[PDB]
Amino acid sequence: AAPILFWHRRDLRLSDNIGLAAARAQSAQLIGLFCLDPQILQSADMAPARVAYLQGCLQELQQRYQQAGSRLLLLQGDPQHLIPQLAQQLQAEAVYWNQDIEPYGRDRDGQVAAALKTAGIRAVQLWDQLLHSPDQILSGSGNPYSVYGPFWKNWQAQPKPTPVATPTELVDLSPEQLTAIAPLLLSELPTLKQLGFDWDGGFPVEPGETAAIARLQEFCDRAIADYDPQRNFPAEAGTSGLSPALKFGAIGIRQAWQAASAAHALSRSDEARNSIRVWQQELAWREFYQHALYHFPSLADGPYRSLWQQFPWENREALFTAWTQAQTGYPIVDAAMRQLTETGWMHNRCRMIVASFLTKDLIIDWRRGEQFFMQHLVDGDLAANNGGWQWSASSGMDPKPLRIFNPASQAKKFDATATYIKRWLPELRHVHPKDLISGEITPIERRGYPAPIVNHNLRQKQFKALYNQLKAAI
């Protein structure tokens, strides 16, 4: 008959889904689909933890569609070829999907839409992963924001959208329709191993829409009240752990905002009020970087500001390798890099410390780090990851005066008792917190733990010197 296809990408859930809800208001014969795109799966920048989480979200999505009344079609190959072909073989009334903010997703999308138009099939692309689309947040001159302050002021005043309905009572495809598309479908969802990946490090939140919704609710029912200042300490489990759920859309952005907003109204404590407002602003910061990537795609290429595109990066491979293997000799840095490679996630404060270290101390083009994070983070997200790294050098959006972190100061300030350090570096559990924080560990009491690969003070003078020299040469 007249079926509508909904194409899932970073919105692996049936609830609070803008494009999916819009599609259901047009037809009950709503068939979901996911395409295993080789340019994404085979990329050297794909993290095993991310594929594991992804695959897990899909397993649940298959069930959700089955329970709703239809199914989730699985495809493997090039999207602009396979999707139009599938829609045509199914005489699809339309193909729906939620818009991307990334260069690759957007280029692919324009190509799929054009192919659909040629075939005479409607393509509806709606905004779903942002509370406010990039086109809704503009300055008085109708231009995007490259400074957070003014962006936050606009974003904050905009009326917030609420969760949309979960589609129900769907009409599944018939055998004759299934025969028409048989050649384009995978019989079943490939396992992690079949895809050639392996992951056993766990997740910040179990895969799937259900687990994501449970975490959001558990966080907003208690821990969120102490977000500020518990968010600052890596040793403390004071954050939500929803990052991969937001990147892959296991949780909708409006459900998250609403749950936090309801907790704020329910709270009668000032401190709890503040903590919740702070968490909410985290979501605003997320949108700032996503809108930035949308408005200024060249950000993805590397250092944005002119001065930084010329910075003389030393690029000593040995130093980078030591960094990636947690063998830098700086406890707070190695404990963090170990948490990343072992669990596929890293506390935000630690991401800031290790990024600053790689860029300021090791003086390595931060792109090597941005790539290493993407190769390991279960929440690896271009907008946020690139935003985080441009930040380590003020080479992109919302720049700040030159500054260099001192691992020792950070460690003492955010891990004063060295609980997080000993947790991820158990072979140093015998050392005094004082020494793990300063990074000055006696050879005998250090065992096999390596000595500092660089002398912070000398690296700091070297970085500033290169900065001032180029600063002048311009």
Ligand SMILES: Cc1cc2nc3c(=O)[nH]c(=O)nc-3n(C[C@H](O)[C@H](O)[C@H](O)COP(=O)(O)OP(=O)(O)OC[C@H]3O[C@@H](n4cnc5c(N)ncnc54)[C@H](O)[C@@H]3O)c2cc1C
């Ligand atoms: C160098 C560096 C790299 C980073 N890499 C990524 C990455 O690849 N993917 C990722 O989503 N985030 C990235 N972050 C941002 C951040 O550290 C995480 O979102 C955070 O660790 C997620 O933990 P959580 O879910 O418990 O966060 P919470 O504290 O519970 O915050 C809630 C949500 O807000 C968003 N968020 C919070 N902080 C920021 C921020 N700084 N920028 C953008 N979004 C934010 C996330 O979606 C997060 O799940 C990076 C930051 C830095 C400094």
